[model samples]
Target: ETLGEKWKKKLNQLSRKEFDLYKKSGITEVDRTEAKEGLKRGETTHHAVSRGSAKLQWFVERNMVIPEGRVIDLGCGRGGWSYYCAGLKKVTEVRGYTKGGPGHEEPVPMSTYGWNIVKLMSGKDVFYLPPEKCDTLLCDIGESSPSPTVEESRTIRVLKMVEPWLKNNQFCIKVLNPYMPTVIEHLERLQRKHGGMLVRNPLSRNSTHEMYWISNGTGNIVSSVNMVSRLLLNRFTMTHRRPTIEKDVDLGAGTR
Candidate 1:
């Protein structure tokens, strides 16, 4: 089958019109631009960090002094965070992990696949490890994409795999700000038996999504209001916002 035909067949919702208009989804341009800029930013990738009622220049500070420890980039995509930790943060080492399978390419459009090849190629080399071993577990999972059931399965598998490593060394994970409250409580208990810090820091950026930095145990629990500030606050005040990479992007017609 033709590539376009293949895509159309797979992405059930994509009609001829939608297929043509998909190029103009706006997200495409924004995501592409952000992807490029991220490449340029590298590990020192500084995004807008929203604080309470105010955005800021620094989240943890560029050169702020923090405890040195092994870094693990959980749910790492295209190795960006791992690369950032090693390249910019000067962390001991970085191990990146994400779901395995044909799921990664579900985002880009067939029309742009040729031009997007560079990113696709770079992305292919990203997920090289599961979250195991280290001082930090940076999980930047997507928001509102996977089905509820699918997400449950995915979460179970992903969390179980990372459980041992995180428990062994204590981990710092990031997830959606909205899900942080419940997810954090759940994760805390799972790892609580071992006894460690379980701090949850909110990380807000230009997009609507928030990043929760989960530390080991409850040594420093980020208050809900503070979490809102860190995760929900829009610090960067970005003019160019990127589109979310969601599961529907991959659906052709039959699948949807």
Candidate 2:
């Protein structure tokens, strides 16, 4: 059997307890039902289930997340990851914060339900960091500017914003793989000052991303957190949705 066969069995074998927690945890029944629709275009159950399962298992089995705590989901894209965490009994609440990008905004499905859409050109960037009350901090720093320079600059800005909160909360940060090598120094400095452990795991494309999970306290059984995955249905789905731009040309639109 190949990898596809492997994950096929993996998803079906969701332990009874884990499945129950996900079904009954506080998300509306409609929300869980809608979850199968998934975070990517042309939805599929495997896309959604696989995305939530991989990382959720890592944290749950290791107990990296806090019990009866609130998660500050910064830059929550479609809120898929947050939705998964919100389904756990240990996670009491999931609060999402996002700055509307070049289009309409909708209420994050993970926390705030219902449709609250807004369109605007300018507004104060939401940089609220509630360290004292935040048990877990989830961040995805991405920019619409296609320029690498602009994106990297934006990454640093966000890095500084969350730097102060690192000492106080368990942060699960997402950054592009291309930028990870350069960004490692600043991140290393932060964790080195506060703690000795920082685990790097690849998400999505093998060359485009890596996640950093700090050591608030996990056993010494694994002294490192480097989990390199050959396949990951993460990032764009859980981080940012590209703004839909209307095209003037409808060429080849009859290819049905």
Candidate 3:
């Protein structure tokens, strides 16, 4: 099938929640350009942060690690996650990175929201780090696209880039692919790639946006079968699928 046809099929298969997320996320060239422009203009507030608010809260309530542990936010667009995490009381330090240029400044009030607890950094500069540098990590970078394959690959790349800095299974990633089937497919791929388990929020399948935990674990025979099949077939060829890979363009920002 043509790439356009694959996209259409994926769109038609989206659940109500997934459909809504796709409708609101600005993945189009026009929307992405505008978003980049807003960042350059130093707009401190944006609709994207609100969309990931619940997931951020979910991360907070999980009590994933020690209160004094450090956390990093990759692609911390509007600084909402950084601010919220800094104020968590238990967390000792909050670091953030963004590639949106100078316009991507944190708001004055929010900038100092957890001034004593947070440290913001540039996405361009912090590429290398020692292993397990922080107790936990938060990535909310895939904001625009709906393609699970592209988003998944990018997430894996980012995760590995920051892998040495993550302390074991202490990372919470926010995924933009709302379609359950594609979500499952990508997670399985990750599981196969890293020899780890992909544990997600119980409500992920039903929610518009979801959070997931990637840690070491076991896999069954079906997972192995799926992994081999993925290697043999391009996802868009499936009768139904969500998202696609743009071979010519990178789907994620911040890093890589």
Candidate 4:
């Protein structure tokens, strides 16, 4: 309780001001560079007054978030998570997807993932996808809806959207607990079909949310496990980002 609660308080600190402050300013867009800097400064650490970063950091500590790949952050609100992923070296690229619906006083920046990162508004048939394939996919959206069925449908829809490309990729999802039983079936599908690793982390004790990380047996987990463990020790210092540490070594296929 002490550790989790302390981390919770740390995350709660600069939350809403991280993004929602722009809502009142009529600023619909974000200066992605500034937001990238914000992540290093720990500003993009929270999703909303509702919340993220710690869940992400929790994933970081658990040896998930395999480095050196492109990342697609679906339900990419404010692009903070995109910036977080892009900040990691060898991540190569990060593209985010946003619904871009109403409620903004002005047209905001869609891909706050920062400079050199692309933003997608979706396209043609199978609009829930990117132009090319990605190595890692992360998604979390529509958790506030009143109906569980709609939320569940959307959650599974994104899973289905990427079902064809699941081979040799990473997927991390945040899902409300009520719909989770329904969602686990997809995990089973991935496991049976692809024979990868699956990780489940609760958002917090008794919290309504949980995180899922799935690997499609593409990444060399042994070396990446060391990299993921080292991310939190210095809190994102260059010492952790040194090329030697991130390089994929043939440590042989690792186990769960």
| Per-residue alpha-carbon lDDT of candidate 2 for residues 1-256, written as tens digits (9 for 90 to 100) | 3232232234335466543432222211122333344434444222322233344435444655442376666665454455555545556666656566666243333221211121112222546544436677766555434344554566666767776655566666654322333455665565556552444432232223344444455322122312322232222123333222211111111100
Q: What is the lDDT of residue 128 in candidate 1?
A: 42
Tens digits of per-residue lDDT for model 3, 1-256: 3233345456558788666555423221112444355546655433222223334554456554223468777767666566666655567787777665665544222333355566656544334544436766776655434564665565555545654555454566654442345455555665565444433443232212333443434555244433423322243233433322211111111210
How many pairs of residues collide in each model? Answer: 25, 1, 5, 3
Q: What C-alpha lDDT does candidate 2 achieve relative to the native structure?
A: 0.43
TM-score per candidate, in order?
0.43, 0.51, 0.51, 0.52
- Best-fitting candidate, measured by TM-score? 4
The pairs that clash in candidate 3 are 42-103, 67-90, 131-164, 132-164, 147-243
* Best-performing candidate as measured by lDDT: 3
Error of 4 at 156 (Å): 2.2
Residues 130-245 of candidate 1: C-alpha lDDT, one tens digit per residue: 33455654555644322333433444444455565654453444433323344446545654554544333222332323334344324533354254343222222223333344
Cα lDDT over the full model 4: 0.45
